[PDB]
């Protein structure tokens, strides 16, 4: 029925400005109060502002006054949001959501978007340096592949064309000196390997970097 389509993941440098996007479908866009929100990890949600597309009159928040700017186009059925003078405190994921109640509004929201993620840092597109993880043999064994020094997220990890999918733990990426880094585990019995091929396949579409890697002990 109804659906909100926020723009994809976006990033920019501090001090600069960014223009988000939230498209609508399945209902009368003009006559509904569209809202935005800011979600940072450690905290909850922070109301940032709202808008009525028909007249496009605004209602911001005291904390975010002068910081953000709301607009709305009728033909495109799209809602917008523009931040300015950015800082790492603005690094977060933002949402768009509809307030139920046709013309007059109500006390609640009804439908939401998938959220738009925003990152900020002075850095460039960098491919990772995939390194192998082997011990030095057991019964049951764990191996893995480590990536390091890449930008931006995401990065896909497979194990022989995704043939494997058990006891696997591809850990989320952390940050060091403005660069991402993660790891990944694999689980097999003592037999399987080194007696058989066991490779980890990595992909970083941003740097357009495809890398396969068969791991070997020492």
């Amino acid at each position: 029925a109804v659906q909100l389509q926020e723009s994809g993941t976006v990033l920019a440098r501090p001090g600069a400005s960014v223009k988000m996007s939230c498209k609508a479908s399945g209902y009368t866009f003009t006559s509904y109060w569209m809202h935005w929100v800011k979600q940072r990890p450690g905290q909850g949600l922070e109301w940032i502002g709202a808008i009525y597309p028909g007249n496009s009159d605004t209602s911001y928040n005291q904390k975010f006054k002068g910081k953000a700017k709301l607009t709305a186009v009728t033909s495109t059925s799209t809602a917008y949001m523009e931040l300015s003078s950015l800082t790492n405190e603005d690094s977060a994921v933002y949402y768009c959501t509809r307030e139920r109640g046709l013309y007059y509004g109500s006390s609640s929201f009804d439908y939401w978007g998938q959220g738009t993620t925003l990152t900020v840092s002075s850095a460039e597109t960098t491919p990772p340096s995939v390194y192998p993880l082997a011990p030095g043999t057991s019964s049951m064994v764990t191996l893995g592949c480590l990536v390091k020094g890449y930008f931006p997220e995401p990065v896909t990890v497979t194990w022989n064309s995704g043939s494997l999918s058990s006891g696997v733990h591809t850990f989320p990426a952390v940050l060091q000196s403005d660069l991402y880094t993660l790891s990944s585990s694999v689980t097999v019995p003592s037999s399987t390997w080194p007696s058989q091929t066991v490779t980890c396949n990595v992909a970083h579409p941003a740097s357009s970097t495809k890398v396969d890697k068969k791991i070997v002990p020492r």
């Binding site: 909850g44 109301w47 139920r100 609640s108 390194y131 192998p132 390091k148 850990f171 585990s185």
Partner: protein
């Protein structure tokens, strides 16, 4: 502004275990409350508006209750799909404010982690880098304390920890610690240990290794 407050931040419950979340307003809100669900996969939808009014197209296992300040939401019978972070909000005055959030989790038996340490590979060790990795897979209460005692000496500058969310398979957590050094420092100490102090058993599970071996 109007400060909303949830009694907690993370909870524990199994299948069918009827449980509740309790939001608390800074003051009166005249029963203008609404409940929301946010999957860890980003998506978010509504369940209730006006304390206990069901949105068109939600199951009757959910419900609601509210009055003045102390409000709540219950599920008299849980299903696997109902695991997420649950928010609330006041619809009384501006600005609209939410609760801090309450994440869910399945409670099961305690379990020690499967530790596995990894010295820095050669491919790295020639690039000047010196990264020591320690996996801690399939364990319970997320509350773990990890430490690296090189030559028996507590150290933090160099470590970067990563945590995975609750596993959708068997509901167990995993941790990926990783100590980073420069070649010169690595080539001046010998014994490197990944100590994983955990609740399950007083014994800290240690996975050590000597570079001379």
């Amino acid at each position: 502004d109007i400060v909303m407050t949830q009694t907690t931040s993370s909870l524990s419950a199994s299948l069918g275990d009827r449980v509740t979340i309790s939001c608390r307003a800074s003051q009166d809100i005249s029963n203008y409350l609404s409940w929301y669900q946010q999957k860890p996969d980003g998506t978010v939808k509504v369940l209730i508006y006006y304390t206990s009014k069901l949105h068109s197209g939600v199951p009757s296992r959910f419900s609601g209750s509210g009055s003045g300040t102390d409000y709540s939401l219950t599920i008299s019978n849980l299903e696997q799909e109902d695991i997420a972070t649950y928010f609330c909000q006041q619809g009384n005055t501006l600005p609209p404010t939410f609760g801090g959030g309450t994440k869910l989790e399945i409670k099961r038996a305690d379990a020690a982690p499967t530790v596995s340490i990894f010295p820095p590979s050669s491919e790295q060790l020639t690039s000047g880098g010196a990264s020591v990795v320690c996996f801690l897979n399939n364990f319970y209460p997320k509350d773990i304390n990890v430490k690296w005692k090189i030559d028996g000496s507590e150290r933090q500058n160099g470590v970067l920890n990563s945590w995975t969310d609750q596993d959708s398979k068997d509901s167990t957590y995993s941790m990926s610690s990783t100590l980073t050094l420069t070649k010169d420092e690595y080539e001046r100490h010998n014994s490197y240990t990944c100590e994983a102090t955990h609740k399950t058993s007083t014994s800290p599970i240690v996975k050590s290794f000597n570079r001379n071996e």
